[PDB]
Each structure stands twice: as C-alpha cells, then as structure tokens.
Amino acid sequence: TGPILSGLDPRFERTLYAHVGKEGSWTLDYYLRHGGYETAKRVLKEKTPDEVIEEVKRSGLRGRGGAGFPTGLKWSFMPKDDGKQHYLICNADESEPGSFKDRYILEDVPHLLIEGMILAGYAIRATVGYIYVRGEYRRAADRLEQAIKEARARGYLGKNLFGTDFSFDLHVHRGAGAYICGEETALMNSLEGLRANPRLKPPFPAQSGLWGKPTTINNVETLASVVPIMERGADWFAQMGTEQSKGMKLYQISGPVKRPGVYELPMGTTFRELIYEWAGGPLEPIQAIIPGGSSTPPLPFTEEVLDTPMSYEHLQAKGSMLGTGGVILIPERVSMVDAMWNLTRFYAHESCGKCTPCREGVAGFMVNLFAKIGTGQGEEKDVENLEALLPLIEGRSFCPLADAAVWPVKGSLRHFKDQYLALAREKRPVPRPSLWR
Amino acid sequence: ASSERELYEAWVELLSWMREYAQAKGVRFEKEADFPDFIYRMERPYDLPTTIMTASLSDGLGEPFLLADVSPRHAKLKRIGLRLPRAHIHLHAHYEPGKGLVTGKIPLTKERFFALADRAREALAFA
Amino acid sequence: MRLERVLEEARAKGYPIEDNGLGNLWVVLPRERFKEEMAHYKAMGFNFLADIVGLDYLTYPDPRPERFAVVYELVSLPGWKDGDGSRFFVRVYVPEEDPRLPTV
Amino acid sequence: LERLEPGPVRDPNPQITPPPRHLLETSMEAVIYHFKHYTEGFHPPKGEVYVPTESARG
Amino acid sequence: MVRVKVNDRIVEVPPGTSVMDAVFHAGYDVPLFCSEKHLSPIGACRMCLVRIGLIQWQPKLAASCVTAVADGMVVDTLSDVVREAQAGMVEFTLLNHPLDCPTCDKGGACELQDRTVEYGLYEKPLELPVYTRFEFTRRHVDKHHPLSPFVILDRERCIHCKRCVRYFEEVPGDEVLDFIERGVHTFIGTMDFGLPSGFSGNITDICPVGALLDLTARFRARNWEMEETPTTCALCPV
Amino acid sequence: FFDDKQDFLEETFAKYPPEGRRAAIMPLLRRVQQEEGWIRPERIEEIARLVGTTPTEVMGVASFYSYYQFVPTGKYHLQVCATLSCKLAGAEELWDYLTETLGIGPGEVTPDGLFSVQKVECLGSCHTAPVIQVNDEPYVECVTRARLEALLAGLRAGKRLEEIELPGKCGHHVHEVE
Numbered sequence A: 001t002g003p004i005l006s007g008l009d010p011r012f013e014r015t016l017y018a019h020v021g022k023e024g025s026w027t028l029d030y031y032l033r034h035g036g037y038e039t040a041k042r043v044l045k046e047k048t049p050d051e052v053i054e055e056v057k058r059s060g061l062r063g064r065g066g067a068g069f070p071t072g073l074k075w076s077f078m079p080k081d082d083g084k085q086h087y088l089i090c091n092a093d094e095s096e097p098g099s100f101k102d103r104y105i106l107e108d109v110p111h112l113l114i115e116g117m118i119l120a121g122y123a124i125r126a127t128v129g130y131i132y133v134r135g136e137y138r139r140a141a142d143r144l145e146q147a148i149k150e151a152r153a154r155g156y157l158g159k160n161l162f163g164t165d166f167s168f169d170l171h172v173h174r175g176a177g178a179y180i181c182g183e184e185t186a187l188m189n190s191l192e193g194l195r196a197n198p199r200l201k202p203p204f205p206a207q208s209g210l211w212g213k214p215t216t217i218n219n220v221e222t223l224a225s226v227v228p229i230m231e232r233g234a235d236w237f238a239q240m241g242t243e244q245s246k247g248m249k250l251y252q253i254s255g256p257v258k259r260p261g262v263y264e265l266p267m268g269t270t271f272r273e274l275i276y277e278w279a280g281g282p283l284e285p286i287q288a289i290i291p292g293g294s295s296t297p298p299l300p301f302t303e304e305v306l307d308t309p310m311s312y313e314h315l316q317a318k319g320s321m322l323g324t325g326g327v328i329l330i331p332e333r334v335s336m337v338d339a340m341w342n343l344t345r346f347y348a349h350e351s352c353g354k355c356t357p358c359r360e361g362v363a364g365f366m367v368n369l370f371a372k373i374g375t376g377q378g379e380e381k382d383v384e385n386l387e388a389l390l391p392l393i394e395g396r397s398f399c400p401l402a403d404a405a406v407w408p409v410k411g412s413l414r415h416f417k418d419q420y421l422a423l424a425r426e427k428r429p430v431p432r433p434s435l436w437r
Numbered sequence B: 001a002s003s004e005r006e007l008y009e010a011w012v013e014l015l016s017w018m019r020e021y022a023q024a025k026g027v028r029f030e031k032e033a034d035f036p037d038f039i040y041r042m043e044r045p046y047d048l049p050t051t052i053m054t055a056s057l058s059d060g061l062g063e064p065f066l067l068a069d070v071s072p073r074h075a076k077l078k079r080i081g082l083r084l085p086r087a088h089i090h091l092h093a094h095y096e097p098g099k100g101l102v103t104g105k106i107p108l109t110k111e112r113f114f115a116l117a118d119r120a121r122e123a124l125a126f127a
Numbered sequence C: 001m002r003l004e005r006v007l008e009e010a011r012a013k014g015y016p017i018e019d020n021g022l023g024n025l026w027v028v029l030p031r032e033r034f035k036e037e038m039a040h041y042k043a044m045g046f047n048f049l050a051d052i053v054g055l056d057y058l059t060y061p062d063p064r065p066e067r068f069a070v071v072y073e074l075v076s077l078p079g080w081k082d083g084d085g086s087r088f089f090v091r092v093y094v095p096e097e098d099p100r101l102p103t104v
Numbered sequence D: 001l002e003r004l005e006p007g008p009v010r011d012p013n014p015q016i017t018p019p020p021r022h023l024l025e026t027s028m029e030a031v032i033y034h035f036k037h038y039t040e041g042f043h044p045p046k047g048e049v050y051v052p053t054e055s056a057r058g
Numbered sequence E: 001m002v003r004v005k006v007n008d009r010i011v012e013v014p015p016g017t018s019v020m021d022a023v024f025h026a027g028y029d030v031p032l033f034c035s036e037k038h039l040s041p042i043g044a045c046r047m048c049l050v051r052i053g054l055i056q057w058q059p060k061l062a063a064s065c066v067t068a069v070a071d072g073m074v075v076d077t078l079s080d081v082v083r084e085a086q087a088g089m090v091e092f093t094l095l096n097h098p099l100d101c102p103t104c105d106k107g108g109a110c111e112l113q114d115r116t117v118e119y120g121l122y123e124k125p126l127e128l129p130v131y132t133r134f135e136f137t138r139r140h141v142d143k144h145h146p147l148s149p150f151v152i153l154d155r156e157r158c159i160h161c162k163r164c165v166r167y168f169e170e171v172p173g174d175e176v177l178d179f180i181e182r183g184v185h186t187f188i189g190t191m192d193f194g195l196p197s198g199f200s201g202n203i204t205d206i207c208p209v210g211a212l213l214d215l216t217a218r219f220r221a222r223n224w225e226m227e228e229t230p231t232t233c234a235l236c237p238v
Numbered sequence F: 001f002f003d004d005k006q007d008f009l010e011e012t013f014a015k016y017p018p019e020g021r022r023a024a025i026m027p028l029l030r031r032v033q034q035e036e037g038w039i040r041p042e043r044i045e046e047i048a049r050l051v052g053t054t055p056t057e058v059m060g061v062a063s064f065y066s067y068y069q070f071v072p073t074g075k076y077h078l079q080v081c082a083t084l085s086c087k088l089a090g091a092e093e094l095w096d097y098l099t100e101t102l103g104i105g106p107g108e109v110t111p112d113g114l115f116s117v118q119k120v121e122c123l124g125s126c127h128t129a130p131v132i133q134v135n136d137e138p139y140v141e142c143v144t145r146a147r148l149e150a151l152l153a154g155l156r157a158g159k160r161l162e163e164i165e166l167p168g169k170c171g172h173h174v175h176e177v178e
C-alpha cells in the first residue's frame, strides 16, 4: 500500500516466480520475450560500475546465503584497476535442511542469472565468472550449460558483447557436495583443485583471491537481485521490505505445513502471515520453528514470536539471526532432542576438521553425549557436562560453523532444557511416532 | 549390562573369523592393541575372555584393508566397530537381546562379514 | 615486635627488605655497616643468633648483586625471660673478589 | 588415637600430587601426570624457605 | 618499532611481527602446537588464542601468533579465562589420544605431554579431583605400519600435526602425503608407499608426537636417558 | 583411458589458467565415476600422472567427497536423504524399510548388484520430502513404500527410472502434501 512495507501488498510482485514454473524459460528467446541483455547493453553504455554500485548502495542490498553484509560495502573491499582480472564465483551450492531456495531458479530460468552475473561481472570488472554449482543438482547444470552455449552463440558472450570490449565468459562447475565447500576460502581450494581447508582470512578473497587475483563470490539470490535493481531503481527497491531489511526475499518453509516450499515475499512480513496465509497453515502441532537456514536458534511455537517480522534485524531483537530463509517447523510429536541429535549427526559428518576444537571436540564428544542420553542411559551430570562444554567451543573456531552449531542446541537448552533433563535423569528412550504422513 | 558378556563373546567370535579368513586367503593378520585395562590391571579383577583389544587384516604391506576394534570394559557406548580404510565405511555392531549381534539392525553372519571382506580385499587391494 | 624497632630503623637507613609471603624476611645490607648494625640488635635484646648460611649464586637464572651472599638468622627466644619470638634474616651480598667479612 | 578416623591420606590436587594408581587404567590425563610426576617431577616456584621445628635433637 | 605491552612489560619489536614472539621475548608464554620455527603459521592449533587490548578487548580470541602486532597494544595472557580455555582445548585434544605413554617414545620429547601438565588442570582448592568428562570408547585406527626402511608409522599417534605435510610443501616443495578422509574420519597417509624424497627424515623431529620414529632405535632406549651430544657433521661438505 | 578422450581434457583445461590445472581433477573423476560406477586405483594414479601431481594428493582430494567411489557399487545407487526434514517426513522409517527390503546392510552391494545404498545429507528438496536420489539422475521425490517399491520393482526388472513412474503426485516448486 504505502512504501517500505511488506506483509501483504497489492503492489508486491514476484519476479523470480513470475516465470519460474513456467516452461521454456530455458529458451533464451523466451527470456528475451521477458526482457534482458537490453539492460546490460544500456548499463555498459550508461553508467560506470561505480555508479551502479552507488545505486545498489542506496538499495541497501545485503548479503544472502545467510549473509547480510551490504553488498555495496562489499564492493568497497574491491580494488578496481590493478591489471588483473577478477572472478565472479557463484556460490550455487547450498545444502542444509530447509534450504533449497536457489534450486529452482537454476533449473528454470538460467538466462536470468547469467544476465545478472554479466551485470555484476561488469560491476566488479571480472571478465570471467565461474558458477560453482553443487554437482547433485544435475538438471541445473544441464540447463546452465545449455544457456552459456546459447548466449555464446548470439554473441552475448565472447570478448565483445555489444561491440563493447567487456569480455565476459562463464563456466559451470559441478560439485561433489558438502556445506563447507561453500566456505569462501575453502571453495577456492576446491575449485583451484585442492581439498578444502579454509585459508587465512585477513587476506580476504576480496583483496586477493584465486592465484592472487581478487574474486568476489555471490549467492544466486543476490545476483538475481541485480536485474530488478537495474531495471526499476533503488527507491523502488527500498519501497519493498523494511528499512532494516529491504526488498523481497526468497523465504522458505518446511515441516508440516500444507504447502511447503519457497515463497518470494517482501521482507518484514511476519511468520504468522507466511505460515498461515501463504504456506497454507500448519497441519500438526508445532513445538518450535527453526527460522531461516537451520543454523539459526530455534524458537518455540508462540504467538508473540510469530508476530515478529521475519527479518535480519528483528530476530536479532529476539536474540537470533536470520539464515537462508529456510524455516523448519518442528512438531512436538518428535522430541526436540532428536532434532538436535540428528542435526549434530549432520554437522559431525561434515566437519571441516580444520576447526580442530570441533574435530575432536564436537565430532568426537558432543555427538556421543546425545546418543547416550536418549537411549535412556543419561544422567543429569552429563547434561551439565554438555552445557559446560559449550562455551569452550563457542567463542572460537576456524570456521564459524561450530559456533553456529551450538546456537540451535544452545537455544534449545535455554528454553526446552527441561525436556532434556527429564528424559536423561529417568534413563528413558525417546518416543517414536510413526512418521508415515 | 551383561550385554557386555555376549558382546565380548561375539567379539571373540568375529575375531576368530578374522583369523579364519586370514588363513583362508593366506592374507596378513596383525594384532594391533591390547587392553589398557590389562596393562594397568595388576591385581584388580580381569576376566576378559581374550587379551586383545584391537586387531586388523592387512593387505600384506602392513596396511590394513579392514580394522576391527572392540570397546573397553568400562568404556561406555559399548559396541564393536569396523572400518574400511579409504572407503568411509564405518560399521557399528550393536548387540540386540532376543536376536543376537546386529549390524545396524540386520543380524551379522560370517558370510556377511566375508562378503565385506572380499569386496574390501579385492577392491581396495592397495598393494 | 623487638623486630619493629629494627624495622623502622632499617627503613630509615633505606635497606631493602625482602619478604616471602611465607612471612620470612631478609634485610639487605652492605658489608661495612653490618657489624655495628648487628651489634645494635643484640643490644636491642636479640637473644639468639641461629644461623649462618653461605650462599653461592654462581649460576642463577636471575641477576643478583653478588655471587657470594651470607645470611644470618637472628631470633629472640620468647621462652627466655626476654625475647618476643622475633625471628628474621639478614642477607648481605658479598664481593667475590674479597671473600672477607668481619665475624660475629 | 581419639582424634583418629578415616580420611584421604594425601592432598588430592593431582597437579602437585602424584595420582592414585588405580586410575591409570582409566584416564589419559592421569597417565600423563603420573608418568610426568615420577619422571621429571614438578617445578615449585622460585623461593627460599625456612621453617623452624622442634626435633628430638633440638 | 612497534610498541607492545604484553601484560606487565613493554617491548619494542619492529612491525609485521607476531604477537607470539613478543610474548616469548617478554617472558610470557603460551601453549603452542601448530606453528613452528622456520615455518609459516596456520591457525590450526588455536593455542595461541589470547585477548588483546588496544583499550578494548576482542570478542573472539585471535591466535596471537597469526595476528600481527600493533603499537600501544596490550596482550593478556595471565587471563583466568585463557587458562580455563587452555585446559579445554587440551581435553579436546586428548579425546582420542591413545593411551600408550610407557611405550610412547615421544616421551620426554612429548612436548604435548608437557603442555598438558603445564596449562591443564580442572576448574575447581580441590577436595576431590576430576579427570575427565569423556568416558566413551576411543577411536581405534592404524598402527604398526612401517612407513619406510627407517620409519615406523603408528597412525593414531598423530594429533593432526599438519607439520610434516606442511614441511613437504614449505621446505623441499616436494609433496608425498595428504590428509585422507574428512572430519574425524580423517587421517594422513602417503600413496608413494615409501617416500623417495631426499629429505624426509627431519619429520621425525618435527612430529610433535611419536608417530614417526626411527625404527632402528625403536624400543632401544628412553628419551631422557640419552646423552645428546652436540657435535658436527662432516658427511657432506655442509 | 581418457587418452582416447583427451578432448574432454582440452575442453576442461580451457576453463582454467595454465597453472590452474588441478581443478580439472574433479571433472575427470566424475567422468570415471559415471562410466565405471566407481574408481579403481589405477585410474586415480592415472589422473595423477596426467595432472602430474602425486597420487597421494589426489587420493585425499578424492576422499574429501561423498560422491566419489572406489568399490563395486550396485547399479542403481539409492542415495537416501536421511537428514532432518526428510527424517521428520519418515525418511527414518523409509531407511529402515529399504534396508530390510534389500536386506543388505550399508557398505554392502546386493548380491544381484543392481543396488548400492548410502544414506545422504540434505538434498535441499525438503518441501518435497522424503526424497531419495538414485545416482545424480533427477530427484526421486516424496517416496512412500508404494512409490518406492514400484520404482524398485521396475529397476528390479531391469528398467530405467524414467520408464516406471510414481503413483500419487507432488507439487512443483511449491509442494503440497495432501
């Protein structure tokens, strides 16, 4: 209605679902028949990279993939003019429960991304870009590979793109999975061909990346958002979402809700609105909801919580932080314990190990604690132990995942503690509802 | 509880098999470890049916293709584990009462173990 | 306490005053002034000269002023008709070059 | 004899005390400290010390 | 030079330098396991985590060693919180460290051992000790693997000393090892099967555990017992 | 081997800097993976030789990933999502069922050799849970015992996955469960 609003808006419009689920959108020409390239042609010829930076810098565009670092500032870490090209690396892997948003974008609207990346590319003066896709999404890798041949055919790639000696080229790079392959330094090993080990970080990829050449890595969503920006202006961007969290975001949900999936909604819409109105209400008694990503602190199912805006900065004010928009709704049909159990059985698999504290500590110890307790072999002592173990991990890690991995269980011991203390002290196995839905 | 005993008895069993296969194929066996709690046992009751905590089958290069370890006496989470080098295959033997010794939940048999072994032996065949 | 009239004096004469948190105390003197100082103490009612420990600080993992150092332990026997239990050490760093010192 | 009853017989700070040997069986940290104690033996801090006592001989 | 104060003492020490070194110059100390003389650090041991004021205090304890220095800096090492944490990390390290001390021939040279006892000890004056919170069975993995005509390898010794793998890169620039599986499943190995590098044996010394030992003197003597006779080589003209 | 298919290298080498070569290892592996269903030692050594690196290096690297393989693995590699969302969706029960269906434990290959198993981490298809993928060929969404066995029996009968289709249905990008 009015501006800088979210929730339900007559003037909200989807764009990243304006044509997703609509087929043949892997035809360039179909894509064409809903803009693009035009916008690049103009931009190259209109405004400097710096100027479109400033545009986004007014847009306030934040990071994605659980990031929220304003991308303007993120360009402020870039050099420009150093005789060395730069690289645009798409963090096109995400994998974590509740997390799946980028997926369909890759599958259904390749030529979009590519335009966004051409735009972005030019912006960070990178004449080649790698899209590093998880190699588990096959369709997406196919559809992308096809698109790059398309664009290359029509001379939208090459070394001249509109006779403009912006030279821009892409390659797709199919993964072999693991969260950590996302890590900004780790990825650089992976790609450059070397098993991940997160590197030194006072060197940022930003100031020197791949073989010295400074790279910028962005999430798909982020990249997609460049096109709307260039199309419709930063004021128009600011017009959507809160001051705090501007634009729309690809919020997602999972768990027992009538329609789970990705809902591209303005930012500052409440949980309540999303969960009931859009997702289609719950189906089953919810214990808690793990809002965003899954690394986010899960917060119990409560009204006052639901009415909080789903945002970067108000889950903040509930002492949490925003993930990838990947909510999980958790029933009390299962035990919360069993959730965190399973969660740390994920993390433990996926340990970098580079976080040593977390190699031996978590992926050795922490996990085993759970296991003992919920067979019904626990004692209060152990939970106390476990509790006390947490700050020893918490501060410090070589990748901030561990510290993120504590946060859910941390929260669950802040709130739901009781449940743990019960089942443990009573040497009681966790219940098992039949999960045939 | 006394689960322990049948497990131990199973651990011997399994070990026996490991030797059998070893001789059978002529493939190299080496005992790896003995119990701490045997070393530092020194008048406190010992009654374990063997002395052997860890043992392995090696290719014939001193490199194992199969490791086989029991949990110690009072070391909680009593299970027996296997793991195939360079495979990321980690097997957790439980005991289940009213059944026998189970691999996840599927009862172990010697043949199961042999199959695991042959695929190991032949596949990984590091030497 | 007998000690105290020595202590204010020591302080007055600026002598450094070592103290272990185990409540043991040394008084760092020069060689010259020792004898007389120590004379005054016995006069002040110091009963009992218990010890003389000769110290070799040939090799030490901290610096010391001298290599040879003597230490007297003087005591006031309170179980005697005089005394207060006033027990304390006097340390006196000693030139290696001259291994001299007036007796007590 | 009147003032005599059960109790631990040495200081239970295992940093400064050698540990019980009925526990080597158990923890590594035990083993480490044990080993260490009887090899190297601790470092007391720097200091001089004296205590006067009454022996039989004075 | 850079104006440093580590706790109670100040030092000049020119810039670009590690906090760590100034710490040791200052006569203050920390447990240390990853980084080493003549070698570029990594953060891996995470033992050199301190807090620093410059005057505020970092929210995350940076590996001092890895960080550069700053003028007017305060370094806090006698922190109660440090000591606690040290112990912590120690415990974590010890989780799978297999009990083998008497036959450990890293032994007197088990610097790891010495750090443990230095910096460790439970947080509690005690009236009853604690030793652990761990109690589950340890990992059991690889041992008695001759790695070379000179060097025996028993794998579960390694702390994930990354030193040797690192060495191979840094020093000869000839590599032959690698970490294998990920996470806790990991472990270092070769696939050379006998390392044809002309420099190799230094890794024995580098190994901050007893994983790589000189088989020829395995079970032959004990660390302390040896007379370590500084003397001169002549076997090459170096 | 790919000394007949060196072209694939040329294709991939163009993507990299002259000295950026090690990246290609990943594609090479995945190529081998497809064609032989796992990786024999020699191949890895061969890749190593090609890229000029040490085998050991390449091994660790290989070993850094779920995807790659090194043993006889049954033809239809059922890569069962086991993680949270799916677990909540009865992937738990599914995994029980599967394992008992084939009988054979994990790390085993069916004696027939048409079925390799592995639990697996999130497939980011949580909305369409519980989902499993058979090889990297598109996601077998929201399977139930019926859907599962129908697929199984088809595979069991030597068919391909896009020849036997699933009863019930699922939503698209947004899913609906009933």
Ligand code: SF4
Pocket: E098, E099, E100, E101, E102, E103, E104, E105, E106, E107, E108, E110, E112, E113, E157, E208, E209, E210, E211
């Ligand atoms: S490596 Fe060190 S702590 Fe371990 S058994 Fe050897 S000497 Fe003991």
Ligand code: SF4
Pocket: E157, E158, E159, E160, E161, E162, E163, E164, E165, E206, E207, E208, E209, E211, E212
């Ligand atoms: S073998 Fe030794 S030096 Fe090498 S990583 Fe392991 S602990 Fe460090």
Ligand code: FES
Pocket: E032, E033, E034, E035, E036, E041, E042, E043, E044, E045, E046, E047, E048, E063, E064, E065, E066
């Ligand atoms: S010496 Fe290990 S983190 Fe610095």
Ligand code: FES
Pocket: A096, A097, A098, F081, F082, F083, F084, F085, F086, F087, F121, F122, F123, F124, F125, F126, F129, F131
């Ligand atoms: S938890 Fe299974 S696809 Fe996400």
